[PDB]
Design a protein around this ligand. Structure first.
Ligand SMILES: Cc1ccc(C(=O)Nc2ccc(CN3CCN(C)CC3)c(C(F)(F)F)c2)cc1C#Cc1cnc2cccnn12
Ligand SMILES: Cc1ccc(C(=O)Nc2ccc(CN3CCN(C)CC3)c(C(F)(F)F)c2)cc1C#Cc1cnc2cccnn12
Ligand SMILES: [Co+2]
Ligand SMILES: [Co+2]
Ligand SMILES: [Co+2]
Ligand SMILES: [Co+2]
Lengths: 276, 274
């Protein structure tokens, strides 16, 4: 299943856990979630290495085992993969396969000058994220934090659902803001994600009206606006038909009432008929 | 310049097909008192403004005034007027087509074009400043300086164009009716903010709605310029970004006599490039 790494290999491969950012040539790509994450290269693969730091050194462990426990079950083309771990001396380390095209969020915003995603590619990424969510649901997992920053992209730009360390309020369904734990909340957050894919806009912008992307649904329903007004201008290949089809899916996902939202298999089917 | 027969530009524009170019028509846009069409003649891709109805002979006077000013405005950084057509009706002005469109469209990455790098943006700023400087040396006030009026050729060389004012770009004294080149400087400062941020000059749904108001926020230290930098560049170092922001801040001074003149702006952008 998992390759058992030794802490000292992981130390050597991250260049002794170089803390300088990769933009400068170091190995540190991120922080947060009770650990720092470093780019490395092991077993002929570029990898992401999360080294856990120290609150209560036993709850760290708790989280360490939990992640391995859940990641063991979750293996799918459209999920991020846990290569292995190290329970070895000094620290705890988790090793994931590195996705070189980053998050869907960064590419939608064209961070660092990457070219804009085409509509074809956007459609395929939506289908893939839907498939990964479907795997999570079929096997009785709730993601509880679906967002564009939790969708990574590999060399081929295939969607890989991730969960970096109760959710993100700009993506949260009303019932989830009230404490309910259900997959239908995942479907709602995914509807927000589809709005991001269509518009290229972030989910929340404090300096924008509306501040929340989901509210554009209202503006379109009250016919103060239309979807064409919000289409990302950074594509030349987007046809009105399939854009409206994706918007329909997203709108159905964003129903305030959780039992009126489609399940993930329904979404899958609608996104299929979108490009069929 | 070249005198065209009206039927020639009619032939070359597909009889002034008014459908937009995206539909397969020839209409590039709506400017001044006429419509702008794409055409091709004499080994040159051209933009043809056909003027329409406003008193008719004042139309002819504007036509003649444009030919007179553009006839002796030939510069690397200005739009190049190729010719015209005055036989009967209508009046037509022919310019050389700029295939990379306007700075506004490229800053917004319209139709999926890649984002302009920081280096390219700096060279475009310098070129636009050179065009303004040419205009000002020859005692011309532009009166409508905006990113939509900065075109770009195959090499991304900035070309100033014109087709009163745009309120998101206007200096306070220009809003009160004054006519001075110092207003041009203020508008250029807005353009520089656009180049830094990728943001449009006005956004009705944004706080603030006017990009120029970010200066206040930065000066009132509610924010920093790094908060506003376009994310769509990987080559923007903090030093030269802050340098161009300084230039834009000086250009945006409310007191017209406290703004630098165009040559000082050229010097400052120059030093920014190092
Ligand atoms: C450091 C790191 C830590 C954790 C995870 C991670 O995604 N863990 C994960 C945990 C649980 C679940 C499923 N559960 C969710 C909770 N829910 C309550 C139950 C179901 C899933 C899921 F993928 F399946 F979704 C993933 C990924 C990375 C990464 C990475 C990485 C790889 N390449 C790059 C390139 C740039 C940045 N990162 N990066
Ligand atoms: C059709 C057309 C007509 C006119 C002009 C035009 O800019 N005329 C102009 C007239 C006067 C002046 C001088 N100022 C003196 C002081 N006066 C108060 C203001 C005026 C200047 C100036 F360049 F010098 F600025 C320019 C450009 C075009 C174009 C075009 C074109 C070509 N390719 C493309 C690609 C995309 C979009 N457009 N486009
Ligand atoms: Co604020
Ligand atoms: Co001829
Ligand atoms: Co350089
Ligand atoms: Co509104």
């Amino acid at each position: 299943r998992f390759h058992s790494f030794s802490f000292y290999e992981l130390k050597n491969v991250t260049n002794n856990f170089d803390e300088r950012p990769i933009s400068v040539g170091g190995n540190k790509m991120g922080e947060g979630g009770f650990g720092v994450v470093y780019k490395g290269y092991v077993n002929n693969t570029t990898v992401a290495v999360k080294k856990l730091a120290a609150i209560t050194t036993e709850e760290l462990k708790q989280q360490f085992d939990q992640e391995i426990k859940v990641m063991a079950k979750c293996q799918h083309e459209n999920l991020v993969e846990l290569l292995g771990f190290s329970s070895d001396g000094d620290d705890l380390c988790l090793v994931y396969v590195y996705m070189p095209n980053g998050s869907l969020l960064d590419r939608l915003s064209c961070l660092d000058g990457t070219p804009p995603l085409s509509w074809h590619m956007r459609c395929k990424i939506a289908q893939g994220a839907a498939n990964g969510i479907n795997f999570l649901h079929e096997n009785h997992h709730i993601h509880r934090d679906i967002k564009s920053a939790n969708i990574l992209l590999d060399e081929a730009f295939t969607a890989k659902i991730s969960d970096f360390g109760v959710g993100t309020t700009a993506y949260m369904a009303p019932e989830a803001l009230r404490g309910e734990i259900t997959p239908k909340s995942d479907i709602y957050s995914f509807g927000v994600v589809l709005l991001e894919i269509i518009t290229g806009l972030p989910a929340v912008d404090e300096h924008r009206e509306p501040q929340l992307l989901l509210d554009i649904k209202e503006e379109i329903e009250d016919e103060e606006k239309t979807i064409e007004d919000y289409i990302d201008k950074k594509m030349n290949d987007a046809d009105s038909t399939s854009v409206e089809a994706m918007y329909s899916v997203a709108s159905q996902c964003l129903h305030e009432k959780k039992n009126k939202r489609p399940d993930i298999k329904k979404v899958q089917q609608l996104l299929q008929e979108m490009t069929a």
